[PDB]
């Protein structure tokens, strides 16, 4: 006979999830960034890190070389528009605008760690955008094949991958003939938000992976859930079984983040249909960034990063890593430690860390945003924040370890000649 499934539906992060969050949790705190934290390049800012893996989840070496990609940008000491009004270098204007101008670097290393600077992926002219944001660049094979997926922003914010290879010598590693920049998907509006309903819309950090269950390929993203700015409607399910006294909603029905999915038509990665999402936070938080896998125990962990300043009205919670887990890809999922959060960074310094990654061997990754040195003053970091292992044990995460500044050791090395 059929075997009725319950149908797919999105997971609602709801309102009543988000007043579980607990921002004093030593078991989900990020450890301190000390004051004395070194920096890897004098010449540009790093933020978005993203470990070179393979489709199936596995960080990835070459030949023996760590390779990572990063969101990069100039360091512009010498620039009028960044000199205060005794003519000293304001280091946090130029950080602020790094956004306008990020383009995609590689780095590498024996080590996993001590990174030697590879530069642009990109020559100049290849991007069709003014602007390259995250997204994963997945080795293909054994000739050192990638398919850089990333976000080209500006006009717009698309999907896109660009095909190039990675080439080792004993003295380094090189990125070549990434040339073809290849559009494959943007917000369609009755699924994802589009800018024409929300200037403000996200669309970006593509994630792809192959289902360990199914063997299909598939990727997240962060959206937006579709409509006009303002719409949206925070209705019993958003709220969700919220205490007495907590009923206000506020303005929060301007809060519509969501983890999209698409599909791939193909082994190749090369035409995609979008899905419905995977996890919507109406009335919780506009901004479910980075979204990402690790399959552990025949269970999905769907992690995703955020900002306290992006929560809806009446709630909050600190920047970082939030996450939940499902037996299926497609749900329904639960949130980690009955709130969602996994790891936040610490009251006492809340901005000391973003864009965090988990990998599959419990490590999350993370860069140096602002870290307190006094009363007022603060230093600004572009570079990478201490790797912190975490342990994922059914609905619960627990903090373990505290390793050093930008370690992302591979687990597979990939043995690569053209």
């Not at 130029?94 to 642009?120: Q, V």
């Not at 922003?153 to 003295?171: L, M």
């Not at 303005?251 to 899905?275: K, M, P, Y």
Request: net charge negative; charged share 20%.
């Amino acid at each position: 006979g059929i075997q009725p499934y319950k149908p797919t539906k999105a997971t609602i992060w709801s309102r009543a999830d988000a007043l579980k969050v607990n921002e004093y949790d030593p078991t989900t705190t990020q450890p301190l960034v000390s004051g004395d934290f070194p920096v890897m390049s004098d010449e540009v800012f790093i933020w978005d890190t993203m470990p070179l893996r393979d489709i199936d989840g596995n960080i990835a070496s070459v030949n023996g070389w760590s390779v990572i990609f990063t969101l990069t940008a100039d360091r512009n000491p010498t620039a009028p528009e960044y000199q205060d009004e005794q003519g000293n270098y304001d280091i946090t204007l130029d950080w602020n605008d790094r956004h306008g101008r990020a383009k995609m670097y590689f780095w590498y290393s024996r080590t996993g760690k001590d990174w030697i600077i590879g530069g642009r992926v990109m020559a100049e002219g290849v991007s069709p955008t003014a602007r390259e944001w995250s997204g994963t660049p997945v080795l293909l094979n054994e000739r050192g094949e990638i398919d850089l997926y990333y976000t080209a922003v500006t006009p717009g914010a698309t999907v896109v991958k660009v095909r190039g290879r990675v080439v080792t010598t004993e003295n380094g590693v090189e990125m070549v003939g990434f040339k073809k920049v290849k559009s494959l998907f943007e917000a369609d509006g009755k699924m994802y938000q589009t800018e024409s309903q929300n200037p403000y819309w996200a669309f970006r950090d593509p994630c792809p992976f192959r289902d360990p269950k199914s063997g299909k390929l598939y990727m997240l993203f962060e959206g937006n859930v579709a409509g006009e700015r303002g719409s949206h409607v925070v209705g019993p399910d958003e709220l969700g079984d919220v205490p007495p006294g907590y009923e206000d909603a506020g303005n929060s029905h301007f809060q519509t983040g969501c983890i999209g999915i698409a599909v791939c038509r193909d082994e190749d990665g090369d035409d995609w249909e979008l899905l419905p999402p995977l996890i919507t936070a109406v009335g919780v938080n506009d901004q479910t960034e980075r979204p990402h896998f690790v399959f552990q125990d025949g269970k999905y962990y769907l992690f995703t990063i955020s900002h306290k300043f992006t929560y809806g009205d009446g709630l909050t919670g600190p920047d970082g890593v939030y996450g939940f887990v499902s037996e299926n890809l497609f749900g329904p999922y639960v949130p980690l430690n009955g709130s969602g959060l996994v790891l936040g960074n610490p009251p006492s310094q809340p901005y000391q860390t973003y864009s965090h990654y988990v990998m599959p061997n419990g490590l999350v990754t993370s860069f140096i945003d602002s870290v307190p040195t006094g009363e007022d003053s603060y230093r600004i970091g572009g570079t990478e924040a201490p790797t912190v292992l975490i342990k994922l044990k059914g609905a619960q995460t627990f903090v373990l370890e505290e390793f050093d500044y930008g370690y992302i050791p591979p687990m597979i090395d990939v043995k690569v000649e053209h």
